Design a protein around this nucleic acid. Sequence first.
RNA 1: GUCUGAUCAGGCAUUGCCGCGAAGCUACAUCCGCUGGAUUAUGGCUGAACGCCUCUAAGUCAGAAUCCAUGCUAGAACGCGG
Length: 179
Amino acid sequence: TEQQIEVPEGVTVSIKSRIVKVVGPRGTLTKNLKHIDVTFTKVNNQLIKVAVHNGGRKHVAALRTVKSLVDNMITGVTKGYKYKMRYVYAHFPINVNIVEKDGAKFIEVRNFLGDKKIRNVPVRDGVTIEFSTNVKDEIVLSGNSVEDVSQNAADLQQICRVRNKDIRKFLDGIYVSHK
RNA sequence: GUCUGAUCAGGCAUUGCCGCGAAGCUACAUCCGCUGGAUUAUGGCUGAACGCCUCUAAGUCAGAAUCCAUGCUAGAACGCGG
């Protein structure tokens, strides 16, 4: 089938082959968007329209999602999402520095479990990670994208997953709060 | 023990006669030794198939000795080539 997605006043959508751009005051975000047959390069003024002729189970998947991610990219570049995690610790005081001053496209977790060491991961695109107010448990991501924003949830969770000691007993772990 | 005439001074000979070191070599001994790339279980990330949902169909990431290259020898098919 075919679907329609509009664009408001202070946003400019521009799909140009599979390469998409959505423009907003936070940033301008690129991903790709094109499956088998389906042509999303049909800009009818405001309405960007996905259209395909064929159907089928796995085929209808890439009809909806290319429609969805342009609505999600406008919410990302305009408003900004907030994906939610928390630093948890058992006894030892888990210490964090953020992507400002010291962190030059990296975040850090030190004193995870009983580390004298450090478990380090980089960060993705133009994500303005809002850790703390004064001090908080919660770290909360926000950026210009949708994907790259919560990718800094993935970055931070996997690098210090509770592996070498058990997750069940030892409660040093930065788990997800909710999507 | 015997010969060189004898004494004597010198030789053969009995495994290097048998008793004790340093050339020449060595240990029971001396010296030395881990770079980048590709990805899996697994966990997530945006988002489906399928009004909700979730790692995959579009889209997109973190990730294992071994894998793989660093380190040393070599008939362009590898000793290049001035």
